[PDB]
């Protein structure tokens, strides 16, 4: 799966973090992003933890900080950033 975003929900976590449509996640917390499932599980499990993202906007790197919104979940407090993945 291509680690590109399609849209960012307004007034969400990825909105205040600076993420935009077309941005490509490259690194998360230092280590590169080879599996999109790792970033998905990091956004899911961590509910209010600062995640350092190295993205490539327009082909150029940029450093942002993402703080997932603690969306209510039955099992446990879940993390929602408001990112729409790339349409397959």
């Amino acid at each position, epitope marked *: 799966i291509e680690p590109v975003l399609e849209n960012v929900q*307004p007034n969400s976590a990825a*909105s205040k973090a600076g993420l*935009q449509a077309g941005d490509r996640i490259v690194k998360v917390d230092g280590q590169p992003l080879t599996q999109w499932v790792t970033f998905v599980m990091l956004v899911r499990d961590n509910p209010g933890k*600062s995640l350092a993202l190295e993205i490539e906007r327009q082909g150029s*790197p940029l450093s*942002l900080t993402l703080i997932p919104e603690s969306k209510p979940g039955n099992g446990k407090a879940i993390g929602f950033v408001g990112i729409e993945p790339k349409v397959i």
Partner: antibody
Framework: QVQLQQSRAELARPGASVKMSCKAS????????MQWVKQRPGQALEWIGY????????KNNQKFKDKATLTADKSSSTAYMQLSSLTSDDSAVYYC?????????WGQGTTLTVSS | DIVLTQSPAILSVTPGDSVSLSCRAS??????LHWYQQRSHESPRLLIT???QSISGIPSRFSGNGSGTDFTLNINSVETEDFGMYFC?????????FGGGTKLEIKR
């Protein structure tokens, strides 16, 4: 809680070089992108460029291709901007800003006067 | 090179009316446009992020709308601490560019 301490005012001889600082206080300095913007007295803002502390990647505007040189130091938590080959058109107020998309936290302003 | 055009450059308003500042672009920046307020002899202040999304710090009277290649910043009841320069900055492509600037003066 989050402050950007910029260098004090500067006077420079024409043709020399200057190197101003922007010490960040109150956040993880390596995860947020630093931005440098120019403003001449009475005119609009002018985006000089940005830099990623920790990785050292600096991307400047095409006008500030070689005029501006962006560096970063993680330990001192300080981003430096160097201006080489100074002319009269370099007299302006220079700001540093936080974040890589929108500029949330701004600095005080380093005023550079280039005269002999 | 996305050239943000901020028109007009100066607008005089009686301290109490509404203000709609324009900021037309040249290419599709979608909703990647933010507004900044600069008071005289000060540093810029972040007002609205991404066209309409409000920031945690600005009063309720500051809002805005627009998309693509047309944006508008709305100030409802203008107080005395609202005059000065206003700039629009796009973050869609490279390089980042600011607006021409709109000056808010008091009417007399």
């Amino acid at each position: 809680q989050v402050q950007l301490q910029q260098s004090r005012a500067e006077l420079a001889r024409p043709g020399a070089s200057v190197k101003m600082s922007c010490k960040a206080s109150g956040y993880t300095f390596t995860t947020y992108t630093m931005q440098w913007v120019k403003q001449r007295p009475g005119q609009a803002l002018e985006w000089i460029g940005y830099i990623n502390p920790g990785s050292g990647y600096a991307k400047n505007n095409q006008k500030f291709k070689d005029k501006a040189t962006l560096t970063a130091d993680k330990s001192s938590s300080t981003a430096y901007m160097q201006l080489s080959s100074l002319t009269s058109d370099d007299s302006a107020v220079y700001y540093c800003a936080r974040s890589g998309s929108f500029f949330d936290y701004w600095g005080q302003g380093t005023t550079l006067t280039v005269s002999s | 090179d996305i050239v943000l055009t901020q028109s007009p450059a100066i607008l005089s308003v009686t301290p109490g009316d509404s203000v709609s500042l324009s900021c037309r672009a040249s290419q599709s920046v979608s909703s990647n446009l933010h507004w900044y307020q600069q008071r005289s002899h000060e540093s810029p202040r972040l007002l609205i992020t991404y066209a309409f999304q409000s920031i945690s710090g600005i009063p309720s009277r500051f809002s805005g709308n627009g998309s693509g290649t047309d944006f508008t910043l709305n100030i409802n009841s203008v107080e005395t601490e609202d005059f000065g320069m206003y700039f629009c900055q796009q973050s869609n492509s490279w390089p980042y560019t600011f607006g021409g600037g709109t000056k808010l003066e008091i009417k007399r």
